[PDB]
Amino acid sequence: NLSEVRSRIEDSDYATEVSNMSRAQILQQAGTSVLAQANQVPQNVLSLLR
Amino acid sequence: NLSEVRSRIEDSDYATEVSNMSRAQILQQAGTSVLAQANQVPQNVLSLLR
Numbered sequence A, B: 001n002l003s004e005v006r007s008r009i010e011d012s013d014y015a016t017e018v019s020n021m022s023r024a025q026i027l028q029q030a031g032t033s034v035l036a037q038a039n040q041v042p043q044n045v046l047s048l049l050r
Helices: A002-010 A014-049 B002-010 B014-049
Strands: none
Touching: A014 B014
């Protein structure tokens, strides 16, 4: 019983942690695919107007 | 947030500055095309009368 209680406190079930890792991976790929666009947003206007 | 506020103070959006440069360029070309006329205004009268 002490190993059961200690285990809940320290050991973490994966089934949520694989999902959290997957959500962070999709957020990373979406954030990088957005970052490039953010980078090129200003150049089109300046060069186009200039 | 400090870079945002500092940026507004120092960085200037171009979209107005390209337009200001264009207005100054048209004013320069119009002022030079007027200056020549101003230069030749007196000669026609003096020579014509003389």
